[PDB]
Amino acid sequence: LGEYEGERNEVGERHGHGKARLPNGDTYEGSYEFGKRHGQGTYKFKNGARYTGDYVKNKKHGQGTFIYPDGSRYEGEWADDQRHGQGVYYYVNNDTYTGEWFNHQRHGQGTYLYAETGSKYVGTWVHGQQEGAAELIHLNHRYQGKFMNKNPVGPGKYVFDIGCEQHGEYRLTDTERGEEEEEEET
């Protein structure tokens, strides 16, 4: 059971920028507004995780950067201890996912940039998975099509920097694709 040091009120909560030691081994340097945990502050766990940002409605809400203990991090908007709003995630392989988040999962419009490859998955994410109406933009081409269960299965077209595009259908196997319908730029 840790003990708080700093300022405290006579009837209410601490109500000031103070550092509190959690009984499980965490250090929270932050403020408290309206008798609850509210405002900017830095939470720090015992394994190496961190969270520098705002606390609204007793949880992580507002602008904030979380540092996960596996090496990943996530900056941006937070809501009720879930990832929601505009956010940029940096994974262990420096994969930069910037875009919308909803309820601790990838949802809405997002841009997943591979660091070891160089490709940007720009499009819709449902329940933290790659979904349809998305484009894999590379340094040589860009594939506009539908993605199901982290794979391309629907009809899609590859647009190239040379000035031409080609349509095509993906088969039932993931590593199979039949191509036709080559035109110029629209």
């Binding site: 190239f160 031409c164 039949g178 191509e179 080559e182 110029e184």
Partner: protein
Amino acid sequence: MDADSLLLSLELASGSGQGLSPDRRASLLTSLMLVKRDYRFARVLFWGRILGLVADYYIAQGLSEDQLAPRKTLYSLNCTEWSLLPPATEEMAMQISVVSGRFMGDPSHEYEHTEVVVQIKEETRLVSIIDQIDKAVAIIPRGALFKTPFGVTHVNRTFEGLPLSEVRKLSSYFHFREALDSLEYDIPRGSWSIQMERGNALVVLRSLLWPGLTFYHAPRTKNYGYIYVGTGEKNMDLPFML
């Protein structure tokens, strides 16, 4: 190819990979004249060679009048025996879109497809591939077929070659088929390999849409010709490779 002076018109011409041999050279030199004697052809030229799996095809294209009709196509397992091929239509051109395998080289071999079980002949797919090549990547130099007031445009005898200021220009080469003719404004706009083999004496245009087609042309002498020693596949990963 051409009908006379078949030595400079090489089957290889430092291009297209494979080619003919001195087992198929003299037999073709007599066989084009035998086809010109049997069928009433104004000009006859060796079209190219399909690879196959058990034998080649040795496709020769016999040209009728007006130089724009669906001219005749001839395949041959051996170069002494030659048969006909029907003129291709649109339904046989769209029926081959479901098959993408290699050529077999057997007239009795049929390709099966489950749509009810259906079968298609190798020869109709062969003449459909040949019609797609001659309607897609068949090229001629500038001025090789001059415009006539009667509308025939058979052979331009004025054209002796292209000058040195327009050899590397891709838009100079017209097409043999109808869209005077259609110039090189194709859909990938990078599907041609223009090379200079021996100085400025021979230009080679290799087709990147259909791998195996070499069009040789001399800038000073009127000697132009295309030969397809490809396997007839239509690889749709062309801008993936460009």
